[PDB]
């Protein structure tokens, strides 16, 4: 499978999440995603085929994971935006007020601005601290997906949002959205991963 930020993958033939970013760890191929998407050694499938397994994760507290892929997978420096792509250029963290977009299998590619950093999300499982908040909308299934600026700087991976009964927060004004992502930089240094860029 071609590994592109934002595309769907399943975990143990049951939950769905979205790919965050292609990375490598030495000769190993992988992608970063959200920790709540699977436990260590859970099987990741893309389009019905096994692509790898969860190598490590931390959830709750933090919300991060990376999946190590088989050699057969093609890692790409790109994030899905409809039928087009945004090239990943690096991971400079953007400041509050910066515009950012996110990509995932439920709502597609959505843009907004970063509104606050170091937010705590209180999920049923426990608190997750240190999240950045944006007001781009998102829906159930988008977890793990890419948050990236138009200039191609990877920001982090989708964690959670104030979903309404329709499964997303796209039907409420941007002003009322709290869509949270886990910053990319701590995930890259915690697992010794290098981002695939183009």
């Amino acid at each position: 499978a071609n590994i592109v930020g934002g595309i769907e993958y399943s975990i143990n033939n049951a939950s769905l999440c979205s790919v965050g970013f292609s990375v490598t760890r030495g000769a190993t191929k992988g992608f970063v995603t959200a920790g709540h998407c699977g436990t260590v050694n859970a099987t990741a499938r893309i389009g019905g085929a096994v692509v790898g397994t969860f190598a490590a994760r931390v959830f709750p507290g933090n919300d991060r994971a990376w999946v190590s892929l088989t050699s057969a997978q093609t890692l790409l420096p790109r994030v899905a935006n409809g039928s087009s792509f945004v090239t990943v250029r690096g991971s400079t963290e953007a400041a509050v007020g910066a515009a950012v977009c996110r990509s995932g299998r439920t709502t597609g590619y959505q843009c907004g601005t970063i509104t606050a950093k170091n937010v705590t999300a209180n999920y049923a499982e426990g608190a997750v601290r240190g999240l950045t908040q944006g007001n781009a909308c998102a829906g159930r299934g988008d977890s793990g997906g890419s948050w990236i600026t138009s200039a191609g700087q990877a920001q982090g991976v989708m964690s959670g949002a104030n979903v309404q009964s329709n499964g997303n927060n796209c039907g409420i004004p941007a002003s009322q959205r709290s869509s949270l992502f886990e910053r990319l930089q701590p995930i890259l240094s915690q697992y010794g991963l290098s981002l695939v860029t183009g």
Binding site: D63, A121, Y123, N162, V163
Partner: peptide, 4 residues
């Protein structure tokens, strides 16, 4: 907010 809920996970996703």
């Amino acid at each position: 907010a809920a996970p996703f």
